[PDB]
């Protein structure tokens, strides 16, 4: 396999380079425009406010930027992200390895505790997932059996029926854990269907960019809602674990 | 299993709620720090610049925030969708790290990211298992010789296996944890605490995105900026084994 790993490694590099070219192509024009918009705003501010040097307005933007970066809101001049609800949810984002990061640890104690909380938490959750996975597989296969038997009742071949069940499994899962949530979130978060799918997939892949987070909205008086979703994550991850492993095996087959 | 899963589930829920209490305790005190900092800046600025109304400084901060939201950067390269940074971003997808220190702005970008990640994470997963075993066998070949020195002091060989495997995940730890923490301490101007936090947040694939090496070549050692993806890939393999060993131990107990 040593030759094939160099081949596989090179393929992954190409995959990244092809991803890189596509992402730049799609994203960089808007990034350049934001930069131009920031510049247009400074030049207009200087023109309006003679008592402000280019370089002084430079510091303002830098210092504003740092504070926004640490989660300050432009809209207000006030003065909970760590209410028992969100704090639980934050702990959830760790052990799941999703790690949205939409709220950051500011204390050295917070970070040090997070190092150990994760090192113990992630594998602990890994065990629960395997558990929920095995239970879920057994549960749906037993359930699929009854309607699987109805196809067998109309005299269809056994080797055909396993694959039909396998395909049927994928459809059931998607409805329950992909499309339903996208429709759920579409309504609850006021996102587009594509924003919602993007969130769902980014979540169940455990990537957790944190650009989109269900419940996070400061306005909503829905703390019970946020953990409710975390039960979707628990159930969802196991479904997507299967999907990811199976498409990996598909890639093995193509290889 | 029936008892096991519901017991284990309850244990995890307890763990989460106890985690929650700890975090809130340490982090709720400082919730408003960034809002306080923005305020200190606005007032300090009005005091310094009498020709600016509080309301005029107000619009500026919103208009700046929307620019930064578009991915503008305070300038005083630096493109996060230049080929280097974009490579690294794609990297953050397949690794499932997903820092999000730079987010996708376009609907097309997100849509592609879906199929990319969907066909990319497993592809990487395959190679990782690959590079895990390959390095595993290569280090194991190294392990056997180290086992020989322990064997020629008449230490029972099963202890040598554990002792060597203990040494395995310690030499790897020094190589992949300590080196980067020292490197990052120097290179990123972080504390060794901030560096270990970054390293472990990275290698656990949590990838908060509060701390990022950046893989953006700047000056003096640009080579090393993208290379750290090397450390990540190699590290994730070592950490993969570390994660399983800890998990296996928890299963055992």
């Amino acid at each position, epitope marked *: 396999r040593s030759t094939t790993l160099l081949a596989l490694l090179a393929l992954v590099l190409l995959y990244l380079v092809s991803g890189a070219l596509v992402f730049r192509a799609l994203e960089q024009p808007h990034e350049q425009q934001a930069q131009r918009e920031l*510049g*247009e705003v400074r*030049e207009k501010f*200087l*023109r309006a*406010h*003679p*008592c*402000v*040097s*280019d*370089q*002084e307005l*430079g510091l303002l933007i830098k210092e504003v930027a740092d504070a926004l970066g640490g989660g300050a809101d432009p809209e207000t001049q006030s003065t909970s992200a760590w209410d028992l609800g969100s704090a639980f949810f934050f702990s959830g984002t760790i052990i799941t390895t999703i790690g949205y990061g939409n709220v950051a640890l500011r204390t050295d104690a917070g970070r040090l505790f997070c190092i150990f909380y994760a090192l113990v938490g992630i594998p602990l959750f890994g065990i629960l997932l395997a558990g929920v996975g095995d239970r879920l597989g057994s549960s749906l296969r037993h359930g699929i059996g009854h309607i699987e038997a109805i196809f067998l009742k109309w005299h269809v071949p056994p080797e055909l029926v396993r694959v039909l069940s396998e395909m049927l499994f994928l459809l059931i899962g998607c409805l329950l854990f992909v499309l339903t949530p996208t429709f759920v979130f579409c309504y609850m978060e006021d996102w587009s269907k594509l924003e919602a799918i993007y969130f769902v997939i980014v979540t169940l892949t455990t990537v957790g960019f944190g650009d989109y987070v269900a419940g996070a909205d400061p306005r909503q008086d829905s703390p019970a809602y946020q953990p409710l979703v975390w039960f979707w994550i628990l159930l969802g991850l196991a479904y997507f674990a299967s999907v990811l492993t199976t498409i990996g095996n598909w890639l093995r087959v193509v290889s | 299993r029936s008892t096991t899963l519901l017991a284990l589930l309850a244990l995890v829920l307890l763990y989460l709620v106890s985690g929650a209490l700890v975090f809130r305790a340490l982090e709720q005190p400082h919730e408003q720090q960034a809002q306080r900092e923005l305020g200190e800046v606005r007032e300090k600025f009005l005091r*310094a*610049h*009498p*020709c600016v109304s509080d309301q005029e400084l107000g619009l500026l901060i919103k208009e700046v925030a929307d620019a930064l939201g578009g991915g503008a950067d305070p300038e*005083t390269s630096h493109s996060a969708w230049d080929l280097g940074s974009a490579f690294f971003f794609s990297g953050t997808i397949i690794t499932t790290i997903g820092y999000g220190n730079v987010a996708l702005r376009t609907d097309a970008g997100r849509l592609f990211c879906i199929f990319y990640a969907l066909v990319g994470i497993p592809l990487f997963g395959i190679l990782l298992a690959g590079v895990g075993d390959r390095l595993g066998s290569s280090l194991r070949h190294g392990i056997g010789h180290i086992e020989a020195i322990f064997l020629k002091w008449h230490v029972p060989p099963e202890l040598v296996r554990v002792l060597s495997e203990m040494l395995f995940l310690l030499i790897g730890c020094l190589l992949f944890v300590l080196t980067p923490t020292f490197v990052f301490c120097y290179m990123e101007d972080w504390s060794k605490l901030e560096a270990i936090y970054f390293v472990i947040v990275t290698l656990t694939t949590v990838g908060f995105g509060d701390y990022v090496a950046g893989a953006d070549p700047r000056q003096d050692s640009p080579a090393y900026q993208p290379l750290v993806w090397f450390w990540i890939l190699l590290g994730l393999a070592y950490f993969a084994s570390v994660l399983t060993t800890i998990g296996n131990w928890l299963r055992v107990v």
Partner: antibody, heavy 116, light 107 residues
Framework: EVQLQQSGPELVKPGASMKTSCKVSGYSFTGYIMNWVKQRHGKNLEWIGLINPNTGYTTYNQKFKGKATLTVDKSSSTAYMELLSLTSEDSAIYYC?????????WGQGTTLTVSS | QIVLTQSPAIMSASPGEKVTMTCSASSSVSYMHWYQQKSGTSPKRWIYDTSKLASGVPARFSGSGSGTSYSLTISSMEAEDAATYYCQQWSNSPPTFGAGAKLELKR
């Protein structure tokens, strides 16, 4: 009418330092940024640096970092530029000029001669 | 660090000639300003923000352009228009000028 009146022409020995002066009038000194520009016979007009007379905030052209010290007297609404360790390369006309994007008002200029 | 290029460095116009001097930016600039300077006197803000005339600049003078190319234009050259014209820029610290365009009178 805005007016920048600089101090008169200065002759100093090589190595010596020199301070010139720009008294503004017809507006408020502290309201607008003060810059200094160098003009020799053989080069482009060169921005030396600026001061915010209200804050005392200064930035310099990298080329002049060590050479020039900008200061104001708010009470006498006078801007000062100091040039250090003078070489014949510093023999030029120096202007003070007002502006944060365009230099809208200029002094009459002052001619520095570095000579033994 | 942006470089502005005025070429030719020197030019001549018979009275009534339309004159156009150009200023090239090394990288893209939002606005260009211009200064007129007659020997012995300081430079006077002539055009600012690319196409705006200063207090008493006669209307026969126009500015124009965008990106990395800007132009000062005289509809009809007059005697008193003979002077050095400099383009400056502050879309980027530090501000910079052209080496200048001396406009002589043809006779």
């Amino acid at each position: 009418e805005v007016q920048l009146q600089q101090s008169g022409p200065e002759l100093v020995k090589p190595g010596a330092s020199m301070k010139t002066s720009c008294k503004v009038s017809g507006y408020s000194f502290t309201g607008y940024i003060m810059n200094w520009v160098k003009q020799r016979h053989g080069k482009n007009l060169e921005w030396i640096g600026l001061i915010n007379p209200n804050t005392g905030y200064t930035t310099y052209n990298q080329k002049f970092k060590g050479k020039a010290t900008l200061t104001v007297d708010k009470s006498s609404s006078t801007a000062y530029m100091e040039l250090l360790s003078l070489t014949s390369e510093d023999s030029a006309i120096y202007y003070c000029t007002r502006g944060n994007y365009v230099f809208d008002y200029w002094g009459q200029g002052t001619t520095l001669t570095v000579s033994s | 660090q942006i470089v502005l290029t005025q070429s030719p460095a020197i030019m001549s116009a018979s009275p009534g000639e339309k004159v156009t001097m150009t200023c090239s930016a090394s990288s893209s600039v939002s606005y260009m300003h211009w200064y007129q300077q007659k020997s012995g006197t300081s430079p006077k803000r002539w055009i600012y923000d690319t196409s705006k005339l200063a207090s008493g600049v006669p209307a026969r003078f126009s500015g124009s352009g965008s990106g990395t190319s800007y132009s000062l234009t005289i509809s009809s050259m007059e005697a008193e228009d003979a002077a050095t014209y400099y383009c400056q820029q502050w879309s980027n610290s530090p501000p910079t000028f052209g080496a200048g365009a001396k406009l002589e009178l043809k006779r």
